Amino acid sequence: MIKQRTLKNIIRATGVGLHSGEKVYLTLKPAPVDTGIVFSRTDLDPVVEIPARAENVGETTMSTTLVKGDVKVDTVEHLLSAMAGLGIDNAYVELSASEVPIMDGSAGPFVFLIQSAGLQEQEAAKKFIRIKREVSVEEGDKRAVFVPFDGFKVSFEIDFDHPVFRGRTQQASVDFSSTSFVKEVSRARTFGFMRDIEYLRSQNLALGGSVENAIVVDENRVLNEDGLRYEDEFVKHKILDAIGDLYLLGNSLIGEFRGFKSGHALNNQLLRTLIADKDAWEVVTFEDARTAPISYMRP
Ligand SMILES: C[C@H](O)c1nccn1Cc1cc(C#Cc2ccc(OCC(N)(CO)CO)cc2)on1
Ligand SMILES: [Zn+2]
């Protein structure tokens, strides 16, 4: 059967919250079968735990925030993208503060730390959500869609209206059967356009933001002296964001996501609409990994 996965060993990391600018200590711990991904604020007494599920999303402004009463875990999307790309079902994510550390702005450091610790298969069938019907949400010129597909693929189209894109929309499609999340998506960084800076300022956001954790773009060019990691790094990062948000479903997807100028807000509306429409999805397991429409790396 395709089995559930956890971490083989504990992972420790330190860094800064993109939004908060706070120093944060992160611990990823193995978790039992059917735990899912659970964030824990260990700075609070008692400890406050928030399952990484669509129902716990409280804010979708420039990040995905989990909320339980007055308690937040901000910017979950890049870490959750890492745990989706590595097929992790069960893990405790402990944080000493309100935000996941930004690291280099990408999922790269997370996939490296996790794959350094290793994964552990568990004696329970991995549960998948299979898309059975098309599910579409729009608002204005933004759209986000689930389409039936015997695999997992993400398509994204952005029109950022900026010289750096040379009058073209940026588009990419990745099928994770045939294409490496690790090599082709995980290294795509957070980006900040200087034209958004008075907005971020106005909102007291991106307090931890610098060239160390984001592609910084002025009116014309990437200012990062070492340039881009991918020719299309902006749209590859949008794909990374969407994989992170999609993992709030609580199970790996069998289907296709299409985004059209979509972001955290519309991604989370799509999830809510999918969950609500039980005609459009079912939970499936695979007794034979050889005949399933997806596969995983050795643990
Ligand atoms: C998190 C979400 O999933 C996400 N992923 C991709 C983009 N975003 C949204 C976002 C982007 C920023 C930023 C930023 C930022 C980066 C650098 C920066 O530095 C500007 C400067 N002061 C250098 O320190 C001048 O160069 C300022 C803001 O904050 N939220
Ligand atoms: Zn992001």
PDB file of N, CA and C in Angstrom, residues 67-126:
ATOM      1  N   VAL A  67      -5.158  30.715  12.910  1.00  0.00           N
ATOM      2  CA  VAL A  67      -5.679  31.507  14.053  1.00  0.00           C
ATOM      3  C   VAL A  67      -6.530  30.567  14.899  1.00  0.00           C
ATOM      4  N   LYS A  68      -6.341  30.643  16.220  1.00  0.00           N
ATOM      5  CA  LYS A  68      -7.200  29.976  17.229  1.00  0.00           C
ATOM      6  C   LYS A  68      -7.384  30.996  18.340  1.00  0.00           C
ATOM      7  N   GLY A  69      -8.562  31.617  18.394  1.00  0.00           N
ATOM      8  CA  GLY A  69      -8.851  32.747  19.287  1.00  0.00           C
ATOM      9  C   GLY A  69      -7.901  33.879  18.995  1.00  0.00           C
ATOM     10  N   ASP A  70      -7.079  34.263  19.970  1.00  0.00           N
ATOM     11  CA  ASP A  70      -6.187  35.448  19.900  1.00  0.00           C
ATOM     12  C   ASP A  70      -4.785  35.050  19.434  1.00  0.00           C
ATOM     13  N   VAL A  71      -4.579  33.762  19.154  1.00  0.00           N
ATOM     14  CA  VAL A  71      -3.261  33.145  18.887  1.00  0.00           C
ATOM     15  C   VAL A  71      -3.120  32.889  17.388  1.00  0.00           C
ATOM     16  N   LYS A  72      -1.961  33.257  16.833  1.00  0.00           N
ATOM     17  CA  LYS A  72      -1.673  33.171  15.381  1.00  0.00           C
ATOM     18  C   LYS A  72      -0.433  32.312  15.157  1.00  0.00           C
ATOM     19  N   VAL A  73      -0.406  31.620  14.027  1.00  0.00           N
ATOM     20  CA  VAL A  73       0.831  31.054  13.438  1.00  0.00           C
ATOM     21  C   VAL A  73       0.850  31.578  12.008  1.00  0.00           C
ATOM     22  N   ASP A  74       1.720  32.528  11.722  1.00  0.00           N
ATOM     23  CA  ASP A  74       1.735  33.254  10.437  1.00  0.00           C
ATOM     24  C   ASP A  74       2.708  32.577   9.462  1.00  0.00           C
ATOM     25  N   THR A  75       2.449  32.778   8.171  1.00  0.00           N
ATOM     26  CA  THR A  75       3.309  32.406   7.030  1.00  0.00           C
ATOM     27  C   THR A  75       3.612  30.904   7.049  1.00  0.00           C
ATOM     28  N   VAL A  76       2.564  30.073   6.961  1.00  0.00           N
ATOM     29  CA  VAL A  76       2.688  28.588   7.012  1.00  0.00           C
ATOM     30  C   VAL A  76       2.982  28.023   5.619  1.00  0.00           C
ATOM     31  N   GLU A  77       2.782  28.793   4.563  1.00  0.00           N
ATOM     32  CA  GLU A  77       2.670  28.268   3.169  1.00  0.00           C
ATOM     33  C   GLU A  77       3.996  27.661   2.671  1.00  0.00           C
ATOM     34  N   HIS A  78       5.168  28.241   2.942  1.00  0.00           N
ATOM     35  CA  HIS A  78       6.444  27.731   2.344  1.00  0.00           C
ATOM     36  C   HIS A  78       6.844  26.422   3.033  1.00  0.00           C
ATOM     37  N   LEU A  79       6.704  26.382   4.355  1.00  0.00           N
ATOM     38  CA  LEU A  79       6.982  25.135   5.099  1.00  0.00           C
ATOM     39  C   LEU A  79       5.985  24.064   4.661  1.00  0.00           C
ATOM     40  N   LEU A  80       4.706  24.396   4.588  1.00  0.00           N
ATOM     41  CA  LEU A  80       3.684  23.400   4.180  1.00  0.00           C
ATOM     42  C   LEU A  80       3.946  22.927   2.741  1.00  0.00           C
ATOM     43  N   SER A  81       4.460  23.789   1.858  1.00  0.00           N
ATOM     44  CA  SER A  81       4.829  23.425   0.464  1.00  0.00           C
ATOM     45  C   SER A  81       5.927  22.352   0.502  1.00  0.00           C
ATOM     46  N   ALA A  82       6.938  22.543   1.361  1.00  0.00           N
ATOM     47  CA  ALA A  82       8.033  21.563   1.600  1.00  0.00           C
ATOM     48  C   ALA A  82       7.459  20.220   2.037  1.00  0.00           C
ATOM     49  N   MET A  83       6.564  20.240   3.012  1.00  0.00           N
ATOM     50  CA  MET A  83       6.012  18.993   3.587  1.00  0.00           C
ATOM     51  C   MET A  83       5.080  18.298   2.584  1.00  0.00           C
ATOM     52  N   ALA A  84       4.364  19.060   1.747  1.00  0.00           N
ATOM     53  CA  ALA A  84       3.606  18.508   0.609  1.00  0.00           C
ATOM     54  C   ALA A  84       4.569  17.894  -0.425  1.00  0.00           C
ATOM     55  N   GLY A  85       5.612  18.602  -0.837  1.00  0.00           N
ATOM     56  CA  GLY A  85       6.544  18.113  -1.872  1.00  0.00           C
ATOM     57  C   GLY A  85       7.258  16.841  -1.426  1.00  0.00           C
ATOM     58  N   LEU A  86       7.452  16.637  -0.127  1.00  0.00           N
ATOM     59  CA  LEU A  86       8.142  15.431   0.383  1.00  0.00           C
ATOM     60  C   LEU A  86       7.147  14.358   0.844  1.00  0.00           C
ATOM     61  N   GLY A  87       5.842  14.619   0.722  1.00  0.00           N
ATOM     62  CA  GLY A  87       4.784  13.646   1.052  1.00  0.00           C
ATOM     63  C   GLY A  87       4.704  13.364   2.542  1.00  0.00           C
ATOM     64  N   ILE A  88       5.003  14.357   3.392  1.00  0.00           N
ATOM     65  CA  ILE A  88       4.903  14.189   4.871  1.00  0.00           C
ATOM     66  C   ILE A  88       3.430  14.277   5.267  1.00  0.00           C
ATOM     67  N   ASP A  89       2.891  13.237   5.890  1.00  0.00           N
ATOM     68  CA  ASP A  89       1.488  13.252   6.403  1.00  0.00           C
ATOM     69  C   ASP A  89       1.393  13.832   7.814  1.00  0.00           C
ATOM     70  N   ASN A  90       2.285  13.405   8.692  1.00  0.00           N
ATOM     71  CA  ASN A  90       2.161  13.585  10.157  1.00  0.00           C
ATOM     72  C   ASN A  90       3.433  14.260  10.684  1.00  0.00           C
ATOM     73  N   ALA A  91       3.287  15.384  11.393  1.00  0.00           N
ATOM     74  CA  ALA A  91       4.401  16.117  12.023  1.00  0.00           C
ATOM     75  C   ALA A  91       3.854  17.201  12.957  1.00  0.00           C
ATOM     76  N   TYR A  92       4.567  17.421  14.063  1.00  0.00           N
ATOM     77  CA  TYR A  92       4.399  18.571  14.985  1.00  0.00           C
ATOM     78  C   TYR A  92       5.403  19.627  14.531  1.00  0.00           C
ATOM     79  N   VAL A  93       4.927  20.854  14.351  1.00  0.00           N
ATOM     80  CA  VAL A  93       5.804  21.996  13.995  1.00  0.00           C
ATOM     81  C   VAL A  93       5.787  22.950  15.186  1.00  0.00           C
ATOM     82  N   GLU A  94       6.811  22.921  16.017  1.00  0.00           N
ATOM     83  CA  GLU A  94       6.896  23.796  17.212  1.00  0.00           C
ATOM     84  C   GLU A  94       7.561  25.115  16.831  1.00  0.00           C
ATOM     85  N   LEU A  95       6.992  26.210  17.305  1.00  0.00           N
ATOM     86  CA  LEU A  95       7.528  27.563  17.086  1.00  0.00           C
ATOM     87  C   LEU A  95       7.576  28.290  18.427  1.00  0.00           C
ATOM     88  N   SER A  96       8.651  29.042  18.651  1.00  0.00           N
ATOM     89  CA  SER A  96       8.886  29.850  19.873  1.00  0.00           C
ATOM     90  C   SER A  96       8.225  31.231  19.728  1.00  0.00           C
ATOM     91  N   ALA A  97       7.568  31.515  18.599  1.00  0.00           N
ATOM     92  CA  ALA A  97       6.926  32.814  18.304  1.00  0.00           C
ATOM     93  C   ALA A  97       5.839  32.624  17.237  1.00  0.00           C
ATOM     94  N   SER A  98       5.220  33.729  16.830  1.00  0.00           N
ATOM     95  CA  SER A  98       3.950  33.800  16.071  1.00  0.00           C
ATOM     96  C   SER A  98       4.132  33.479  14.576  1.00  0.00           C
ATOM     97  N   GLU A  99       5.357  33.314  14.046  1.00  0.00           N
ATOM     98  CA  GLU A  99       5.546  33.146  12.580  1.00  0.00           C
ATOM     99  C   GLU A  99       6.584  32.056  12.271  1.00  0.00           C
ATOM    100  N   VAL A 100       6.345  31.264  11.248  1.00  0.00           N
ATOM    101  CA  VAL A 100       7.368  30.346  10.683  1.00  0.00           C
ATOM    102  C   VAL A 100       8.533  31.194  10.187  1.00  0.00           C
ATOM    103  N   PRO A 101       9.799  30.837  10.488  1.00  0.00           N
ATOM    104  CA  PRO A 101      10.930  31.579   9.936  1.00  0.00           C
ATOM    105  C   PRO A 101      10.959  31.557   8.402  1.00  0.00           C
ATOM    106  N   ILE A 102      11.340  32.683   7.793  1.00  0.00           N
ATOM    107  CA  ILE A 102      11.343  32.840   6.310  1.00  0.00           C
ATOM    108  C   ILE A 102      12.550  32.123   5.685  1.00  0.00           C
ATOM    109  N   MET A 103      13.643  31.912   6.429  1.00  0.00           N
ATOM    110  CA  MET A 103      14.893  31.302   5.888  1.00  0.00           C
ATOM    111  C   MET A 103      15.346  32.132   4.669  1.00  0.00           C
ATOM    112  N   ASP A 104      15.591  31.543   3.488  1.00  0.00           N
ATOM    113  CA  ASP A 104      16.059  32.261   2.268  1.00  0.00           C
ATOM    114  C   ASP A 104      14.861  32.754   1.418  1.00  0.00           C
ATOM    115  N   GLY A 105      13.618  32.630   1.900  1.00  0.00           N
ATOM    116  CA  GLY A 105      12.407  33.049   1.175  1.00  0.00           C
ATOM    117  C   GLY A 105      11.760  31.894   0.418  1.00  0.00           C
ATOM    118  N   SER A 106      12.438  30.740   0.299  1.00  0.00           N
ATOM    119  CA  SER A 106      11.966  29.593  -0.528  1.00  0.00           C
ATOM    120  C   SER A 106      11.595  28.426   0.393  1.00  0.00           C
ATOM    121  N   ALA A 107      11.269  27.276  -0.187  1.00  0.00           N
ATOM    122  CA  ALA A 107      11.066  26.020   0.572  1.00  0.00           C
ATOM    123  C   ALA A 107      12.369  25.219   0.668  1.00  0.00           C
ATOM    124  N   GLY A 108      13.458  25.667   0.000  1.00  0.00           N
ATOM    125  CA  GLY A 108      14.729  24.917  -0.114  1.00  0.00           C
ATOM    126  C   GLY A 108      15.281  24.490   1.245  1.00  0.00           C
ATOM    127  N   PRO A 109      15.506  25.434   2.180  1.00  0.00           N
ATOM    128  CA  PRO A 109      16.086  25.067   3.480  1.00  0.00           C
ATOM    129  C   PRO A 109      15.229  24.057   4.247  1.00  0.00           C
ATOM    130  N   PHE A 110      13.913  24.197   4.178  1.00  0.00           N
ATOM    131  CA  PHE A 110      12.966  23.203   4.763  1.00  0.00           C
ATOM    132  C   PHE A 110      13.129  21.842   4.080  1.00  0.00           C
ATOM    133  N   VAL A 111      13.130  21.741   2.754  1.00  0.00           N
ATOM    134  CA  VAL A 111      13.235  20.385   2.152  1.00  0.00           C
ATOM    135  C   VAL A 111      14.599  19.800   2.545  1.00  0.00           C
ATOM    136  N   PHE A 112      15.653  20.618   2.617  1.00  0.00           N
ATOM    137  CA  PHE A 112      17.003  20.119   2.972  1.00  0.00           C
ATOM    138  C   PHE A 112      17.024  19.605   4.422  1.00  0.00           C
ATOM    139  N   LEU A 113      16.544  20.402   5.370  1.00  0.00           N
ATOM    140  CA  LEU A 113      16.499  20.014   6.807  1.00  0.00           C
ATOM    141  C   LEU A 113      15.681  18.721   6.947  1.00  0.00           C
ATOM    142  N   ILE A 114      14.535  18.638   6.295  1.00  0.00           N
ATOM    143  CA  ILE A 114      13.665  17.444   6.433  1.00  0.00           C
ATOM    144  C   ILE A 114      14.382  16.200   5.872  1.00  0.00           C
ATOM    145  N   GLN A 115      14.902  16.292   4.645  1.00  0.00           N
ATOM    146  CA  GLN A 115      15.564  15.158   3.955  1.00  0.00           C
ATOM    147  C   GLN A 115      16.875  14.788   4.666  1.00  0.00           C
ATOM    148  N   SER A 116      17.531  15.730   5.347  1.00  0.00           N
ATOM    149  CA  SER A 116      18.656  15.449   6.278  1.00  0.00           C
ATOM    150  C   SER A 116      18.191  14.576   7.465  1.00  0.00           C
ATOM    151  N   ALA A 117      17.068  14.878   8.091  1.00  0.00           N
ATOM    152  CA  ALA A 117      16.513  14.080   9.203  1.00  0.00           C
ATOM    153  C   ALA A 117      16.050  12.716   8.687  1.00  0.00           C
ATOM    154  N   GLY A 118      15.550  12.685   7.453  1.00  0.00           N
ATOM    155  CA  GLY A 118      14.987  11.489   6.823  1.00  0.00           C
ATOM    156  C   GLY A 118      13.518  11.341   7.138  1.00  0.00           C
ATOM    157  N   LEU A 119      12.826  10.501   6.376  1.00  0.00           N
ATOM    158  CA  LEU A 119      11.403  10.172   6.622  1.00  0.00           C
ATOM    159  C   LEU A 119      11.266   8.716   7.071  1.00  0.00           C
ATOM    160  N   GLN A 120      10.120   8.407   7.664  1.00  0.00           N
ATOM    161  CA  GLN A 120       9.749   7.104   8.254  1.00  0.00           C
ATOM    162  C   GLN A 120       8.360   6.736   7.718  1.00  0.00           C
ATOM    163  N   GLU A 121       8.238   5.632   6.972  1.00  0.00           N
ATOM    164  CA  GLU A 121       6.900   5.130   6.563  1.00  0.00           C
ATOM    165  C   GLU A 121       6.216   4.544   7.798  1.00  0.00           C
ATOM    166  N   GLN A 122       4.896   4.612   7.858  1.00  0.00           N
ATOM    167  CA  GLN A 122       4.098   4.195   9.036  1.00  0.00           C
ATOM    168  C   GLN A 122       3.094   3.151   8.567  1.00  0.00           C
ATOM    169  N   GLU A 123       2.642   2.306   9.485  1.00  0.00           N
ATOM    170  CA  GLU A 123       1.807   1.120   9.172  1.00  0.00           C
ATOM    171  C   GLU A 123       0.347   1.568   9.114  1.00  0.00           C
ATOM    172  N   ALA A 124       0.034   2.484   8.195  1.00  0.00           N
ATOM    173  CA  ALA A 124      -1.344   2.928   7.871  1.00  0.00           C
ATOM    174  C   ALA A 124      -1.363   3.455   6.445  1.00  0.00           C
ATOM    175  N   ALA A 125      -2.448   3.187   5.726  1.00  0.00           N
ATOM    176  CA  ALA A 125      -2.638   3.626   4.328  1.00  0.00           C
ATOM    177  C   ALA A 125      -2.681   5.170   4.295  1.00  0.00           C
ATOM    178  N   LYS A 126      -1.932   5.744   3.358  1.00  0.00           N
ATOM    179  CA  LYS A 126      -1.955   7.189   3.054  1.00  0.00           C
ATOM    180  C   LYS A 126      -3.292   7.474   2.367  1.00  0.00           C
TER     181      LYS A 126
END
